[PDB]
Write a protein that holds these residues in place. Sequence first.
Motif, PDB file in Angstrom:
ATOM      1  N   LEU A  13       0.825  -1.203   0.000  1.00  0.00           N
ATOM      2  CA  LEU A  13       0.000   0.000   0.000  1.00  0.00           C
ATOM      3  C   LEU A  13       0.863   1.258   0.000  1.00  0.00           C
ATOM      4  O   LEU A  13       0.478   2.274  -0.594  1.00  0.00           O
ATOM      5  N   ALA A  14       2.044   1.199   0.622  1.00  0.00           N
ATOM      6  CA  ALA A  14       2.992   2.304   0.503  1.00  0.00           C
ATOM      7  C   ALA A  14       3.424   2.502  -0.946  1.00  0.00           C
ATOM      8  O   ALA A  14       3.543   3.638  -1.418  1.00  0.00           O
ATOM      9  N   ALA A  15       3.661   1.404  -1.666  1.00  0.00           N
ATOM     10  CA  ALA A  15       4.024   1.496  -3.078  1.00  0.00           C
ATOM     11  C   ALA A  15       2.880   2.056  -3.912  1.00  0.00           C
ATOM     12  O   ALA A  15       3.110   2.810  -4.865  1.00  0.00           O
ATOM     13  N   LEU A  16       1.641   1.684  -3.582  1.00  0.00           N
ATOM     14  CA  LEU A  16       0.486   2.260  -4.271  1.00  0.00           C
ATOM     15  C   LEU A  16       0.401   3.765  -4.039  1.00  0.00           C
ATOM     16  O   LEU A  16       0.123   4.533  -4.970  1.00  0.00           O
ATOM     17  N   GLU A  17       0.634   4.203  -2.798  1.00  0.00           N
ATOM     18  CA  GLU A  17       0.650   5.635  -2.514  1.00  0.00           C
ATOM     19  C   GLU A  17       1.779   6.331  -3.261  1.00  0.00           C
ATOM     20  O   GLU A  17       1.614   7.457  -3.742  1.00  0.00           O
ATOM     21  N   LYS A  18       2.935   5.672  -3.371  1.00  0.00           N
ATOM     22  CA  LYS A  18       4.044   6.231  -4.140  1.00  0.00           C
ATOM     23  C   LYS A  18       3.681   6.374  -5.613  1.00  0.00           C
ATOM     24  O   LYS A  18       4.018   7.378  -6.250  1.00  0.00           O
ATOM     25  N   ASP A  19       2.995   5.376  -6.172  1.00  0.00           N
ATOM     26  CA  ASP A  19       2.539   5.473  -7.554  1.00  0.00           C
ATOM     27  C   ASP A  19       1.564   6.628  -7.728  1.00  0.00           C
ATOM     28  O   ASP A  19       1.635   7.367  -8.717  1.00  0.00           O
ATOM     29  N   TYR A  20       0.650   6.802  -6.769  1.00  0.00           N
ATOM     30  CA  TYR A  20      -0.258   7.944  -6.819  1.00  0.00           C
ATOM     31  C   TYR A  20       0.496   9.264  -6.724  1.00  0.00           C
ATOM     32  O   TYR A  20       0.083  10.258  -7.331  1.00  0.00           O
ATOM     33  N   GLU A  21       1.595   9.295  -5.967  1.00  0.00           N
ATOM     34  CA  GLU A  21       2.454  10.477  -5.954  1.00  0.00           C
ATOM     35  C   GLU A  21       3.081  10.718  -7.320  1.00  0.00           C
ATOM     36  O   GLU A  21       3.198  11.866  -7.765  1.00  0.00           O
ATOM     37  N   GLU A  22       3.511   9.644  -7.989  1.00  0.00           N
ATOM     38  CA  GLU A  22       4.117   9.781  -9.312  1.00  0.00           C
ATOM     39  C   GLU A  22       3.123  10.344 -10.319  1.00  0.00           C
ATOM     40  O   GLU A  22       3.481  11.181 -11.156  1.00  0.00           O
ATOM     41  N   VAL A  23       1.872   9.881 -10.264  1.00  0.00           N
ATOM     42  CA  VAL A  23       0.833  10.487 -11.097  1.00  0.00           C
ATOM     43  C   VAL A  23       0.595  11.939 -10.697  1.00  0.00           C
ATOM     44  O   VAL A  23       0.461  12.817 -11.556  1.00  0.00           O
ATOM     45  N   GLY A  24       0.536  12.216  -9.399  1.00  0.00           N
ATOM     46  CA  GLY A  24       0.308  13.566  -8.921  1.00  0.00           C
ATOM     47  C   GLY A  24       1.504  14.479  -9.108  1.00  0.00           C
ATOM     48  O   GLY A  24       1.367  15.604  -9.588  1.00  0.00           O
TER      49      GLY A  24
END
Lengths: 426, 118, 426, 426
Positions: free
Chosen positions: A415-426
Amino acid sequence: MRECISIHVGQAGVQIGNACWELYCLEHGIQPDGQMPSFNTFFSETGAGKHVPRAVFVDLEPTVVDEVRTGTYRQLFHPEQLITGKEDAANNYARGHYTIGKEIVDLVLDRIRKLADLCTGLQGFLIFHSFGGGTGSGFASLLMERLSVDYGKKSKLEFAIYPAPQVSTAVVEPYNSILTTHTTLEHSDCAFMVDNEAIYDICRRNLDIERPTYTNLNRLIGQIVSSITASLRFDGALNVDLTEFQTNLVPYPRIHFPLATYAPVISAEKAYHEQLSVAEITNACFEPANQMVKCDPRHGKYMACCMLYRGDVVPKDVNAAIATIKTKRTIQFVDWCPTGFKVGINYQPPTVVPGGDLAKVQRAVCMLSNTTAIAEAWARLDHKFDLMYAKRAFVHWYVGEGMEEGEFSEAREDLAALEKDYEEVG
Amino acid sequence: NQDEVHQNQILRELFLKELRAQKLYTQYHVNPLRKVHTITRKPMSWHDNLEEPEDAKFLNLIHHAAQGPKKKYSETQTEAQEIGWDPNPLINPDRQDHRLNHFRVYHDITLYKAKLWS
Amino acid sequence: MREIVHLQAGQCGNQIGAKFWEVISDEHGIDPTGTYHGDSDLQLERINVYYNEATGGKYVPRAVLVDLEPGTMDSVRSGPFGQIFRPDNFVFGQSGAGNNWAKGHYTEGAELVDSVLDVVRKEAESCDCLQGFQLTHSLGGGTGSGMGTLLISKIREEYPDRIMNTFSVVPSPKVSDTVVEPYNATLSVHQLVENTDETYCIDNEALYDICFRTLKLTTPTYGDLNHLVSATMSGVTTCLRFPGQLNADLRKLAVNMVPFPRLHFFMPGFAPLTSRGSQQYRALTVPELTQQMFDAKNMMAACDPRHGRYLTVAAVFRGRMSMKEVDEQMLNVQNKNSSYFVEWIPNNVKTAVCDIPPRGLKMSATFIGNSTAIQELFKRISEQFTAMFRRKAFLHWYTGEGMDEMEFTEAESNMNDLVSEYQQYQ
Amino acid sequence: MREIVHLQAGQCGNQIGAKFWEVISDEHGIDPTGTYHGDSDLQLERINVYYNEATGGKYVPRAVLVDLEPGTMDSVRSGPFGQIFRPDNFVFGQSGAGNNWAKGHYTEGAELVDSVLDVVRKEAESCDCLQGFQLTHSLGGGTGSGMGTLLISKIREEYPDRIMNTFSVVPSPKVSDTVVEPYNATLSVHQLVENTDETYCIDNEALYDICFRTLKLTTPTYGDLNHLVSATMSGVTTCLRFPGQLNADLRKLAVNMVPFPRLHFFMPGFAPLTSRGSQQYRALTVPELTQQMFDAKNMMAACDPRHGRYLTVAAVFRGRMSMKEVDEQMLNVQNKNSSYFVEWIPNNVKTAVCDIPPRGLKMSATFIGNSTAIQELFKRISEQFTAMFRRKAFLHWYTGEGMDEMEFTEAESNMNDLVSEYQQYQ
Ligand SMILES: Nc1nc2c(ncn2[C@@H]2O[C@H](COP(=O)(O)OP(=O)(O)OP(=O)(O)O)[C@@H](O)[C@H]2O)c(=O)[nH]1
Ligand SMILES: Nc1nc2c(ncn2[C@@H]2O[C@H](COP(=O)(O)OP(=O)(O)O)[C@@H](O)[C@H]2O)c(=O)[nH]1
Ligand SMILES: Nc1nc2c(ncn2[C@@H]2O[C@H](COP(=O)(O)OP(=O)(O)O)[C@@H](O)[C@H]2O)c(=O)[nH]1
Ligand SMILES: [Mg+2]
């Protein structure tokens, strides 16, 4: 011919399914017996000329489904469709995923197999559950896992309760929530995360009902699912199927978590005194105080918006409202979506149940924005689960159930990696 | 050691005490309206075809039990039964008028196409 | 399905269960004869949880009454609900213990352990799927404090996975009735920590306190004291016996109440207690329920939670409400008195809703809470047990039955380690 | 057609058969005059199994009463069903045996065999198709244990193929009333093993145990004990006299319960034993009968089947039920108590159902089984017989009748050989 099969799990699944099915029956005119004194996407005909709901209610506790069995719609529903267990998980993902699932996994699989045999061309599997209950969590996880290999291409919509950031009906909810996210990541096509507190605030603020209940919430859940399925059920100038609005919602395999909104939602007394038109309803769909997930999209950036109007509406007004919302600096878009709208129109206005709360209104709107503002809720859950797992509380329960404790850290890292991916999109 | 010569008359004393305290069942045969278990007879056994009368109130009990909550109770009892309590449509469903109640239920050649898909 | 067997030990236990079986029989509309005279269908929908079927429309107690003296058994038989119990379930031994833990646990216990084990086994194999047994007893006796531990130890080996609640009565230091009371208490808690899923600490001195002030009864008998504890446990399983908006059972709270296996002691709390002069001037509201619920004077144990940290909190509501008030009052409490809650567990409160109100009443709630204040009791026991043991007084009674000396040493070591890991969690 | 003649030897046999003819006459609706006063047609269809037709619509029992002492029959003729018997069937001597086996088998035996063999010959030739004879006696007598051995020795030569049953009474060590009681039993079992197709090992001591615990009768007379056996032989022949869903007879049971000809000693049981206090608290169900039966307290002989292996078991039921709960409880008890069943015979148990219930009752069940626990009975007698015989005590009474000292040795060898191979089969 388009068909959507219900796979509702848990107490939430049973109550929400009974809600959605009274709305489907009143929409299609079906009497409580199942006789008519459009429908085929949800019902199915029988030799006796009855109409058969295509729903699978599954629960580990008997009483939740026996309430339906002695309810009004007992003859409407199938005794075989309603699948019950004797002993529950009691808010234990490990119990729900490893010890109690395998007893009735085969029965549930066979039931949906016969329902898919009855269906000719399957459009989708609408699956409802919760992230708090051990049943609604672990059983949902395993049935996603087996259903993915049972039907590789058939789409699986995931409507589920997410734990509210402030109020909670459980203490051991975050363990199940963090352990469940793997299945909604790698075994789901769309996810429609909902927390109760947002709907609580909405129904207190707009609907003037100071003492609502779970059926009041389930009314709006049935309303939004009905507005989703209205394009399949009835005619529209731009009909929108499931494939169309998933394609114009999901940019990457890891990003399938849009946030929803229904407008207009006002009681009849206040509905006496205002015009309801396209611009006002689409502006109400954009207010952060009307969002059904506790996050502010103004803190993030929209990168997709599916749009489902309904009722008395003109595409001229639709385009005018689109221009008006595009001309707004408070609303942001990511740089790789100059055009990020998916517009659909349906003719039939949303119907009303007696004993409900919303007034009958000629035009309505359902909004589905994929944004990056949802990751803050996962961050809150990450902090809560971290301070859970620091002292290893409640770990003994799951360990005695029989899973490997490294899966907790693996889910936290995922889930940390998912949040990191959302940061990359953001 | 167990002194049964004393023990047995302690038990006899006790048996007499709940004999004095013993109250008969008051002959109020109640039965669960949920379900009963039954046994199928032999259709040919020259004792099994014996004519024997039935009960008249048990049929009323089932005909009352196997029915929805609205005609059972004047007012609601649980919050799970508020739901769908009133099925009365406030306006008449004029579902024949295509003018204002347009329906996309399968029509015309699409019925034959549904046949042809098989 | 989900059945409860009520194991019964001690004069305190026999009198508690007799009143306990009266209220449920009144709650389920059961006459002294054994038939059913009530009106509602839901009065008999989950009746078989506590009762077993007998011919002629008879429902029999699933209770196993154990005592080492014949004198209690005639009294419970002579009660108005005295003949309703099954005579074969009655088990007793000819000689008592004289409030000696050693005699009940070792000497006279071994002759009656066999017979009760068959009786509970026949009741165990009677029900198809049992959730777990149930025992009410006293920690100051010779059978309930003594013998009663041996039943729990054996049945855990036979039935490990089943839930095990014990409503043990803890002796009070301010008001005590036995000189050898600390010896029985010290040798029972060690058996209590090892083999028990959950314990409810009930003290008669606090039961004397409430009727003095909360009820203002002139002559409180022991029957009145048994009325509260029976009302307490009726609120524990009302969600089990009756459906609600949000359902629960014993495994629901027990998983949610035990962060670590060494702790299973909880604080019972009952809501609707008002004196005769309080009935005229009141408005029955959920906030009025919660304000008395948290007040330290309403509690029925000898510990003030304001001296400690509340680990976890349960509030099971009985009747019809709207959770918005229930959620807002829980949220209001969790924010104001923030120092009394732990910081490593956000959302310490677990809530449940049972729609059926208690008979003769409309609004009620039950409180179950684990707080740091329970260690106030064990250390208060320690300052007497060490004050009993250093001079080897009253030891020849325990030494003569056949044990050696280190059993006391291991008993105090376990409770000292228990409080020591319990202070560290503060 | 299918006829059974009842042989009646000894005071124990005379009183047992007198009450035996009493109950079955109630079952067949026969008055003390001898006519038919019953109501159902089925009450008189197979009445010629036990009764012979007489003019004027009178029925006479097909029985022969033998006893060396004329005193006992005067009580028999003075009984309630006393004049029912045919006077010519009464055959008796003038001097008793004085509880001496040798006097009766040899000395006083040769004179009274000629008369009784004539009477049984006339009754045997009266019936066209005789199934066989039955005898009731005791192993501690002078006549039943004495004379009675010579009768079966002779009639086996006359009628080899016909089945005979003996409900002999085995003396108990705990309560005895004869010095030479082992001596008669030592010389009686040797006659039983050579010439007997099936033996029903009944014991008086368990019969008093049952009425003390299961029936709780304060003053149990010999009539109640004779009533208990009367239900037992009634339950053997109810499926012969009356049709059922699954019919059976004595030869159904004789063939299916004798693995090897040396083993014909069996354990009878009869289910619905409830005390008066137990009538209130029960539910008349097929499981309740099965649990009551397989417990060892129900048993009417002096040895515990828990110490041996159940070779063969049979359960004959009286009443109208369905066979599934008959079969599932049959399967349940076979799997659960696996160690007590032998492995070389799968499906150790045999069932039969007779539709018609016993008079005044709804359900009755009869069990007839072979277990290794019967070898506990023979070795106990050898523990006594050798103790008397080692000192040649009480030998001159036998030695005066003219037989050798070898007969004790060959007999003693016989059951020693019997218990040897019986131990081998364990
Ligand atoms: N929106 C909504 N949520 C519900 C409803 N019923 C239960 N829930 C949610 O479900 C969570 C607990 O799970 P349940 O649905 O009660 O039961 P379950 O899904 O079968 O899981 P288990 O309790 O472990 O058996 C609660 O925290 C609720 O928030 C409902 O009717 N509507
Ligand atoms: N609250 C309450 N306590 C009771 C009642 N009856 C007895 N007690 C307590 O039980 C204790 C005596 O228990 P005892 O009979 O020795 O237990 P036993 O040895 O297991 O039979 C006393 O200290 C009382 O305080 C009752 O009705 N209510
Ligand atoms: N069960 C039972 N046993 C009896 C009855 N009458 C006598 N007996 C037993 O029969 C034994 C005496 O038998 P006896 O008269 O010597 O037999 P006989 O020599 O064959 O005439 C005693 O030990 C009693 O236990 C009876 O009515 N029922
Ligand atoms: Mg649940």
